[PDB]
Every structure is written in C-alpha cells, then in structure tokens.
Design a protein around this nucleic acid. Structure first.
Lengths: 95, 79, 102, 206, 93, 92, 102, 98, 79
DNA sequence: CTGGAGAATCCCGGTGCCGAGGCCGCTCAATTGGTCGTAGACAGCTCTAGCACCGCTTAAACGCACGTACGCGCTGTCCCCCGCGTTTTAACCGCCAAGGGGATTACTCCCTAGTCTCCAGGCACGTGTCAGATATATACATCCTGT
DNA sequence: ACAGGATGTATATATCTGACACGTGCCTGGAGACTAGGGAGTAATCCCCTTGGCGGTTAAAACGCGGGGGACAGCGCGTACGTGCGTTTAAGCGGTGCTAGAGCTGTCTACGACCAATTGAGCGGCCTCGGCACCGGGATTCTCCAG
C-alpha cells in the first residue's frame, strides 16, 4: 500500500504531461446538448465544436484548479474546499 | 442526469492535472455548478451566433468567437 | 518581381495589402505598412516556431505538435505575458508541481 | 410611520397603513383617468418575490389583497386574550376591517412605496411654492410616493388592476410645518388657525 | 471557395529556421489562428490610431506604434528593428 | 472648432426620466465617454459579426445580435425589445 | 428628423455619420442606426434612472459620479456589464465584511 | 486615557473612506513619480494636468480593488490581518505575476 | 529616485480603509509601492508610445485614456 | 534511521498504420503602368497653457511608548478522504443508414452610395441663479469601564 | 447587564459661488429627393455529416472497509500594530511670468485609388513515405518495514 498522496503525485506527473481530454466524451456531449436544449430546442452540433468547447472547459477548469490550489496552500492547508472555489471566482470576478 | 455525468473521478483527474493533492467531498458538486455556469455562458453566446447565421447547426467557429469575446481565446479551429 | 521578394521577406505582401484594403481598417493603406506588418508577423512567427522547435528537440521529436506550442509559449515569459489570454487546444500545462506538497 | 386620524370626530376607529419596499416600477396609466395607474416592475435582476407573485406584467391588486386578507385571517386567530376578528370586506374599498375587542375598528391597508421619481401628471402639482417655498416643494418632491389600489369604478369597470397614488405623509409633514413663517404654532406670536380651521371643517363634515 | 490560410508561408518560415522539423495540421491551424489573431490586434490598434490622429492612411509608423504597444519590451524592440530593416529593403528596391 | 458630445441628448433622456434632477459636468463627461464606449463596442461587434458572414452592410439585425452577444441577459432582452419597438415605429 | 421619425431622443443622423466615418463597414443599413440609437437610449435611460434613484436615496438633486458608481455597482447585471470599467470620481460600495464586526 | 479598542477607529475609517470619494494619494508626489518615470522613458515631456488626474484615478481605483481582493484573501485564510503574500496571491490570480 | 517614496504609509492605509482592510502588516507598504510602480510603468510606457506617435511633445489626457483602453482598465470622465 | 523489497515507470525495439511532404494542373489575385485629386507634409504664426517660482498655511506625515489582540506554535482528536479491492456501468469504437441542413450557383431588385441644395438643429457664447459646501450649534448614534 | 461621559455623525441655518439652464447667432451636416449599381435575398440544388441505433469490449465508475493525517478547536504567549500624543514636513493654493509647442490656416506634392492588362503564386487534387501509437521485456526510479 502506497502513502496516501504518492500515487496522487504520480498522477500529477502523469496528467501534467498528458494533453488529452479527461472528461468522458459522450456524457459531456450529452450535457452540452442538455444545456443547449435549455436555451433553444432542437439544435445540431458539429463534433469539432463539441471537442473545442470541451478543450475550453477543461482548460478553464485547470486554471481554476491551479488558482484554487494556490488559495488552499495560502491558507496553510492542502485540502481544497468550496470556500476556496468561491474565493477564486470572487477574485477572478465571475460572480 | 448529465450533471452527474460529470463524475467525481473526472473532476479528480482534472484536479490532478491541475496539481491538487487533496480534495474534499463537497468540491465535486461545486465544480458541477461552476462548470454548468461556464457552459451556460459559452453555449448562450454560441447559440446566439448560430441564430444570427439563420442556421441550426452550431459550427466550431461560432464557439471560437463566443470564447473570444468572453476573453478565453482558443486557437486552431477557425477565425 | 513580387513585393515579398522585392523586400526580401516570407509573408505575402499582396495578401496583407489586400486584407488591409478590404478589411475596412482605414480609407488608405500606405504601401510600406503591409511590408512592415508582414515583417513583424514574420519575426513573431519565427520566434514562436523557434521556441516550439526547441521544445520538439527537447522531446526529441521532429514534428511540432500543440503540446510543444503550449510549452513554448508558457515557458517564455515575454510571449506568455503576450499570450496569457490564449488557451491552446490539446495543450496541457507546464510541469508545475508545488514544493509544499512534496 | 404616519397614527393617522382620518376620522377625528371618532378616534376609536383606526386606518393603519402598511408599507412595502418595492423595486423600480414602470407605470401604465389606465384609460386616461389621470389617477389610476398600472404597476409594472420595469426590470429587476434581484428577482424580489413580489414579482414572483405577480401575474403577467401588471401586478394583480386583487391577488395581493386576497393573500393579504388570507395571511391576516390566518394569523389574527393566533392572538391570545385580544379578540381580533375578520370583519366583512364588502363596500368596494381597501377594507381588511379588524375589530380589536371593543369598537376599535382597524382597517388595515398595505400600501406599496416606490422611491422612484414622481409620475408626469404629478409635475405641475405641489403648489407650496408661494405658500411654503419652492425649495420645500423640491425637497418634498425628493420624498417617496405611494401606491394603493382601487378598481376603476366607472360604470362597468370591475376588479381592474389599477393603482392610485397616496399623499398622506406629505400632508402630515405640511401639517407639522404649515405657516409661511416656520415657527407657526410654535411660539406664542404666531398662533394660527390653519390646524384649528382644518379640524373645524373635518369635524363639521364628519 | 478558397480558404486562404498562412499554411505555406509558415511552412516556408519553418523550413527556413528549422529544416529538420515537421508540423502537424492541427498545429498549422493553431498558427493560422495565431496569425489572424495578431493581425486583428495590430490592425485594430492601427485603425484606432488612424482615428485618433485623424489620418485616413495607415503607414509603417502606425504599425510601428501598434507593435510597440501590443508586444512586450524586447520582442517589440526586435520587431521594430526587423520592420524598419524590411521597409528600408522595400524602399531601396 | 466644434466638439462632438452627447451632452444635450443625455440631458433630454434625463428630463424624460428624472425631470427635475441635476447632473454635474464630470458626470456628463462620464456619460459622454460611456456612450462613446458603448457605441464603439456595439459598432465593433457588428463589424466583426458582418465580417463573420462576409456582409458589407451592417443592418439592424446585426445590431440586435450584437446587443444579444455583448449585453448580459435580462437587460439585453429588455434592450432588444426596446430597439425592435423603435425600429418598427421608424418603419411606419 | 429621423429621431423624431423614430420617436427617439438620440441623433440617428449623427450615428449614421459616425458609422460612415468609423469604417465599421462600407455600407450601413438604414435600420441599424435607428436600432443603435434605441439601444443607447434604453441603456442611458436605465442608468440615469438608477443614478437618480440613488441620488434621491442620498437626497442629492444633482447627479455626481458617486451616484453613477453606486448605481452601476449595485445592479449585479450592470456590474457584470461594467466590472472592468473604472468610473472616475466614484469611490466604491459601502461593503463591510462580516468577520470584522463585533 | 480614553483609548479605543484597536478595531473601532479602523471601522470608522472604513466607513469614512468608503463614504468618501476624494483622492487619497497626495497629488504632487504622484506628479513627481509620473514625471520621473516619463523622464526615464522620454526626456522633456510636458503633461496635461487632467492626464495626471486620470492617472491618479486609475491608480487609486486599481489599488482599492486590489485591497478588496487582498482582504478577501486574508479573511479566507482564517486571519484578519493582510500580508504581502495575500497581494502576491491576488496578483498571481489576476495574472500580473504568475 | 525617492519620488516613489512619496507614496506615504498613511496614504496606503487610507486606501486599505477604503478597501475594507482591518489590520495592515508592516511589509504591506513597500509591496504596494512596488506594485503601483509596476502599474505606472505599464501605463506610462503606453502613454509615451501614443505621444511619440502623435509627433507631439505634450502628453494629453486622451493619450492616457487610450492607454487605459488598451490596458482593459477602462476609465470614463476624461474624453 | 540507514539499508533491502517490490511495484511502478521510461526507454528498447519491432510492428504497422496512417497522416505531412510534395509535386501537377488550373486561375483568380498580385504586379505594372498611367491619371487623378487630395490627404498629408510642410511652413508660419498665434496663444493657450504648461513649467517654474514665491510664501503662507495647516492638515497631514512622522516618530514613539504600549497594551492588547491577533498570529502562530503546540497539543490532542477524529473523521473524512485516500487507496485497493469488488463489483457493475456504460463509454467507446466501428458500422450504417436517413435525412436535415450547409454551400454553391443564378437571377433579381431593392437599398445604400453618391450628388445636390436648403435648413434647422447643434454648438459657442453670454448670464442668473441654484445645488452644494462652507461653518456652527445642536441632537442621535455609538462605544468602554465599574458594579 | 446596565448606566455614564464622551465622540463622531447627521440635521438645520446664513453665505457664497461657480457651474447648470436657458436665450442667441451662426453654419455645416442632416434631410428630401434622384439615380445607379451591387450586395443581399431567394430558389433550387449537391452532398456532407449528424443522429441514432447497436454489439461488443473494457476501462472506468461506484461502493466498501480500514485507518491516518490534517482540519479544527483550544492553550498559550510574544510581538506587531493600532491608538494616542507630540513633532516637523511639505502639499496646496493663488499668483505672476516665459516661452514651448499645439492648433489653425494656407500651400503645395507624391501616393493610393482606380482601371486595365498580364501572369505567376496559390489552392485542390494527387500520391507517398517517416512519425506516432502500441506491446512485451530490459533498465531504471522509487517508497516502506525493522535490529
């Protein structure tokens, strides 16, 4: 049994090297179609548009997770909290 | 539903790409909310571009211009 | 005798001149301006492709992929401060591990 | 906060007014009646629950007074050792008659209070310029106005969602400052008869 | 009907500076979007400069000012140097 | 020379809304630069939008979609409703 | 005039001249400056409405940029519109954090 | 000695300076700083005084927004006292240091 | 030199009280002074670029306004 | 607290498969060459207006003792989250339609550009007086310490 | 917990006072027509590609269990900063002066618009070969109980 965090840092070294999409394609695409179904009914999507929008959403969440982790380290913790996320979005100005 | 389709270990994989060592159990629902808000905004502006072109097929380039006017510029799909 | 060859450049002076004319940027486009702009774009393209090629050589590959573009832009501080608002698809991030976690 | 003796010949009956802090309201005049307006909450991003109660775009006065009566009837039962009963709502008026246990007839009327600018038909009014000053006119113009319901009672109009303006607080404040000289009924050289003759006229009418 | 990108021009620059380096099509699209982005930045900046000084004629001076604004320090310095050199070449020829 | 300002028009809109309210010269400068900013943003996004469809004619539909893209939700809905009402009144 | 013909307050002719001068496109449609002057009129009306309401709330009869600042920053949707924008002579919101209070 | 608690005068100053709108930085040292940096860039530049006023407006509003975000960082870390690491965090999130 | 020292300690304290700050560390002041110097270096670099483009010798308010326009930190009240 | 034990990871090297490099043929757009007005370059002269300067003023910067209150260090506590298992879920990959809808050409004809001419709205210049800030006394709101 | 002496902020009261609000004169850009063309609309069409479904296949999600390390509360206490008092500074302000350079007005001129011929560079299709993805075994990298 590894130390609780060793294989976590091993995953960090993995996924910072990797470039591919980490969200599963079809649940994400069904989510995008649901959110679009909220706005205008019966819309069709280019698959490249779905992949590009997934790229943008994942890159936005990676930036948000970097700044949230910086905030959580700043409060002398290693555990991130929804308080941390609210701090990050309040600093970014998105709420 | 599809907001549960954004799974707990997918958010954990995104955080491990971001470099997060330790994640609370309430992070996931808040991440679902933030992701839902961000996609509401982006798909709102992209569908607005799509309605302007009198079309019912959302192109990639419309998503590119929506993300451009939000300030999150993405390269490599049209413009 | 093309204007790109006349100036000794690589980027198309005719295409940049056409885009400055029909792009409704001003009523007149002075003839040196597309030359100047093609030169600046040539230098920026050369600098970024230089850093992306060096990133590819550091990964020992002879073909630049978007990962190398991401690493090249985010490692150079001047281009990162130029392009901090630009997300590259299939880019990933820099290797950035926090020392307090180790 | 206006203890408003509208009925000075018998002060045992009260007409207690309640205020309600509303968002900014676009006003639609009804049928050129010059006093009956429609309440339309122009735009509100905070989504205050009055708009959630509203029907369509015009605020339903009948719905407001119905649920207001509903909450009063429901809550005054809970009052112990003070017999407050729901009196008839008849008479095509604000009503909400509540009797407090011995001839204390309280007619509760909730009033909307918009802190917005005055409507255009209230412009040439408030003619206290040569009476008090134009500055007092402009300072009373800065104070908020009020909204009370009455359906347009013109022959066939029934339960219309119209809203007429109230002016009770400005009238009370000019009853506290009524002389051209600002120390009227305050020092013993300027005892006037404005409050006196007004109470005489209102008592004679009642 | 002709999607005019900067693909062959960037490829000429690539084989000029690195003749042993390839490029993917996705990376070529990224460089196309990049060149269009920087072109829009500099062109809008010079357009607004023309509307500030009320000239109707973009010249190399306006592009020089827009480059000095949009780029950071030493990159802008080298870019103004390259542009002045190239305008000198085009003027002499 | 002459200056191009929106000062009297802001004042007319003020007398339409708050008919007996004053406004300072600095606040008028705020609103002049604000109207120039909003005009610049909407005309620029209409120009970009017409360029996206390669149209050389900015129309009222272009301005409508520029309002829908730029301005946030409920205020944009109210503004599109006002603009559509005014254009239909202009056509009559 | 076209402002009278559209029943609007902002000068549609000046907007048409600026669209011709500003080089946004070559041709400018006829309903476009009408629609644009309408949108400017609605935005100016709502912002001056909020500013005058705040001025009445502070009992001031002359609009100063403090009331404009308070009006824009108290509407969350206008705050979403103008979050980057600085109003000069504005100050900020009265905003005390709940951990500071006794 | 009628000494207040160490938070009370801070709270009335917060109420006063959120109520106030005037320039908090003194105008002439700000003018000296602006003329110093512009003389470092291009020698003998005359200044419009309204340009200096606009610079002071932008700088004061930028620092007030920065101090709001700094206060949010310091309250976020279960503290009440700001520190320069809060400022480094806020500018790193805004993207000025990274 | 030392004109950057003209940004006094109680001026930064007044900005903090406008910012809602209760207590202030002793190292806040030099940090704020450096950050303001960096911000001014950016804005004055852009303003000198606009002025030298205008072939003039007098920096005007509109140049500072367009500098702040391209900064994104948009200011009204001076155009 | 240093060595060994073992689970995981990065190249080795073959396979293999499939996307970049590169010509070939067509063709619009770049390049060349006159003509034209005119925007821009240049000169000159005003004249705002920005820089230096005095000199008095007084809030305000600056320094210093000091108590207190908050930061940080330490101490235990515990559960909430990490990790490996153990199950099931469903995403994914490939195929395979059916048709919705994007793109293009082809005619068209309205709508804006452009030109002309007159006005009346828009701006500069007076000015009367009105909101605001001034002080100044007074009252309502908020603390801080002893019983 | 409650009262008392501050202490600051808000309300009312003359007095300014410079800036809004309103009239007045000009004057050029909007308005009202009138024309020409060209962008945009519309019809109709090729054909891409989305939607959906399905089978199989497997990586992954979900749940479970053991436990442990950090979040959290508390004790403690040391110092750093606020509060307050006293002490110099220098910002500010009006005021006048000097001339530097913006701004205006007129006077030319090379340069792009514009048109028109003339042809290559650029793109669409077309083969075609090295670069990237695996898949097992070497080689390395790396954490974890104990005398």
């Amino acid at each position: 049994r590894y130390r609780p965090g060793t294989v976590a840092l091993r995953e960090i070294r993995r996924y910072q090297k990797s470039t591919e999409l980490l969200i599963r394609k079809l649940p994400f695409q069904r989510l995008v179609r649901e959110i679009a179904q909220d706005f205008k009914t019966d819309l069709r999507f280019q698959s490249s548009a779905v992949m590009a929008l997934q790229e943008a959403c994942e890159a936005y969440l990676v930036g948000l997770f970097e700044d949230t982790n910086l905030c959580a380290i700043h409060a002398k913790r290693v555990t991130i909290m929804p308080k941390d996320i609210q701090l990050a979005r309040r600093i970014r100005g998105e709420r | 539903d599809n907001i549960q389709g954004i799974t707990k270990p997918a958010i954990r994989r995104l955080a491990r790409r971001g470099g997060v060592k330790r994640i609370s159990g309430l992070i996931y629902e808040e991440t679902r909310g933030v992701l839902k808000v961000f996609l509401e905004n982006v798909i709102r502006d992209a569908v607005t571009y799509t309605e302007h072109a009198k079309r019912k097929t959302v192109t990639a380039m419309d998503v590119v211009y929506a993300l451009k006017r939000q300030g999150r510029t993405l390269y490599g799909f049209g413009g | 005798k093309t204007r790109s060859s006349r100036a000794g450049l690589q980027f198309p002076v005719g295409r940049v001149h056409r885009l400055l004319r029909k792009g409704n940027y001003s009523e007149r486009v002075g003839a040196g301006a597309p030359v100047y702009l093609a030169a600046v774009l040539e230098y920026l393209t050369a600098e970024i492709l230089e850093l992306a090629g060096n990133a590819a050589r550091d990964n020992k590959k002879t073909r630049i992929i978007p990962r190398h573009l991401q690493l090249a832009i985010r490692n150079d501080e001047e281009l990162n401060k130029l392009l901090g608002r630009v997300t590259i698809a299939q880019g990933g991030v820099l290797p950035n591990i926090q020392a307090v976690l180790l | 906060n206006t203890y408003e003796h509208v009925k000075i010949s018998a002060p045992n009956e009260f007409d207690v007014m309640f205020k309600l802090e509303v968002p900014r309201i676009q006003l639609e005049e009804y049928s050129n009646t010059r006093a009956y307006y429609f309440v339309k909450f122009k735009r509100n991003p905070k989504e205050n629950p009055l708009s959630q109660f509203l029907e369509g775009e015009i605020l339903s006065a009948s719905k407001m007074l119905s649920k207001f009566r509903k909450i009063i009837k429901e809550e005054i039962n809970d009052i112990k050792d003070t017999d407050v009963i729901m009196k008839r709502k008849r008479g095509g008026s604000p009503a909400v008659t509540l009797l407090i246990s011995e001839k204390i007839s309280v007619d509760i009327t909730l009033a909307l209070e918009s802190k917005s600018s005055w409507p255009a038909s209230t412009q040439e009014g408030l003619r206290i310029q040569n009476w008090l000053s134009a500055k007092v006119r402009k300072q009373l113009r800065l104070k908020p106005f009020y909204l009370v319901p009455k359906h347009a009672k013109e022959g066939n109009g029934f339960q219309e969602e119209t809203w007429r303006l109230s002016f009770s607080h400005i009238e009370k404040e000019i009853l506290n400052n009524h002389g051209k000289s600002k120390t009227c009924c305050e020092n013993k050289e300027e005892k006037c008869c404005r409050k006196d003759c007004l109470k005489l006229m209102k008592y004679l009418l009642e | 009907s002709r999607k005019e990108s900067y693909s062959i021009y960037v490829y000429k620059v690539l084989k000029q500076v690195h003749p042993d380096t390839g490029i993917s099509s996705k990376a070529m699209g990224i460089m196309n979007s990049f060149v269009n982005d920087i072109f829009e930045r500099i062109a809008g900046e010079a357009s607004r400069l023309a509307h500030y000084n009320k000239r109707s004629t973009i010249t190399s001076r306006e592009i020089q000012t827009a480059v000095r604004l949009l780029l950071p320090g030493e990159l802008a310095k080298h870019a103004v140097s390259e542009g002045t050199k190239a305008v000198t070449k085009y003027t002499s020829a």
